């Protein structure tokens, strides 16, 4: 299907265009320090108060109200930030469905993109200035619908192997993660 995801972000579209899209925190960490990115979805959902510096995921919201909420909570203090409207692609996972009961923050209803989101996948962006969102959507001329119109997010089934609970987490003892559990868990 062709539904969409929303992400609040303090980086302006010109920066995102030059980046090649909404990339993960761990990518710039990899090219600078050589640190391999962390693809453990559990580490991504937990974080550490902000996002981890080696994080290999890019969080999104399912609705505009939710993405706005991220903006007025997590991006509080920022004069200007953007809510990026994004198309679905098979590198995206529904966190609460992958981590299940052990989802650290289920109220996020977060859909995280593994490896970041190319610029062609960004439909457009709203602008939030001083908390106000009165400007209509700006369309991305770089957006390629043909790419993603026929692609959906990854099923939770595929995400279970990337949950990345600690080796001694009780979730590797239980369904459905036991089927993807690393040795000893």
């Amino acid at each position: 299907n062709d539904d969409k995801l929303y992400r609040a972000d303090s980086r302006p579209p010109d920066e995102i265009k030059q980046s090649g899209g909404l990339m993960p925190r761990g990518q710039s960490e990899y090219f600078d320090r050589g640190t391999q990115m962390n693809i453990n979805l559990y580490d991504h959902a937990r974080g550490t108060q902000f996002v981890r510096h080696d994080d290999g995921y890019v969080s999104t919201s399912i609705s505009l109200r939710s993405a706005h909420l991220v903006g007025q909570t997590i991006l509080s203090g920022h004069s200007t930030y953007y809510i990026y409207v994004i198309a679905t692609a098979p590198n995206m996972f529904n966190v609460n469905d992958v981590l299940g009961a052990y989802s650290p923050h289920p109220d996020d209803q977060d859909v995280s993109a593994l490896g970041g989101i190319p610029y062609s996948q960004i439909y457009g962006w709203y602008r939030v200035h001083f908390g106000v969102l009165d400007e209509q959507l700006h369309r991305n001329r770089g957006y390629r619908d043909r790419y993603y119109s026929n692609l959906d997010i990854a099923p939770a089934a595929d995400g279970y192997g990337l949950a990345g609970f600690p080796p001694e987490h009780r979730a590797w003892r239980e369904e459905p993660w036991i089927h993807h559990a690393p040795p000893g868990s």
Binding site: N91, G115, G116, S120, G161, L162
Partner: protein
């Protein structure tokens, strides 16, 4: 004439290096792809919509979600790496035998020929267990993604079969 290409293979095979060698004309510093890279490359009046998905064992189950409408398969192989050539075979045959990759023509890049201990195409063809595949339109092209050697030779074969 738009041809949808799905470029797969094990991690470190040189897929992203090939993609952006074709796209930008230069080999760039890459990052292990855990997500995907997609670019449209034009060559000989054929818009190659090339998909590059990461080859780490963990995200290989995600490959399947990029099969729909794929007209060509590019399987990249590291020829210096003999430890995982068997692993490369199994994955190749797992891709092409999928219901939605039945009609796909298969270009194999025997990548990393510049390295001295690398396996030659006639060994790779055998070690990838496609010696007796007469049913499918395939071809093994020796390549060096960093230099660009063999890339547009492989695309020429891809173009001739599309």
């Amino acid at each position: 004439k738009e041809m949808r290409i799905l470029m797969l293979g094990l991690d470190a095979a040189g897929k992203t290096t090939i993609l952006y060698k074709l796209k930008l004309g230069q080999s760039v510093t890459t990052i292990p792809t855990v997500g995907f890279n997609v670019e449209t490359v034009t060559y000989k009046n054929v818009k190659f919509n090339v998909w590059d998905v990461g080859g780490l064992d963990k995200i290989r189950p995600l490959w399947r979600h990029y099969y729909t409408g794929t007209q060509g398969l590019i399987f990249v192989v590291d020829c210096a790496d003999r430890d995982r050539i068997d692993e490369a075979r199994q994955e190749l045959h797992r891709i092409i035998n999928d219901r939605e990759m039945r009609d796909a023509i298969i270009l194999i890049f025997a990548n990393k020929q510049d390295l001295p201990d690398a396996m030659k195409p006639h060994e790779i063809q055998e070690k990838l267990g496609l010696t007796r595949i007469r049913d499918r339109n395939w071809y093994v092209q020796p390549s060096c993604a960093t230099s660009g050697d063999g890339l547009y030779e492989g695309l020429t074969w891809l173009t001739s079969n599309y």
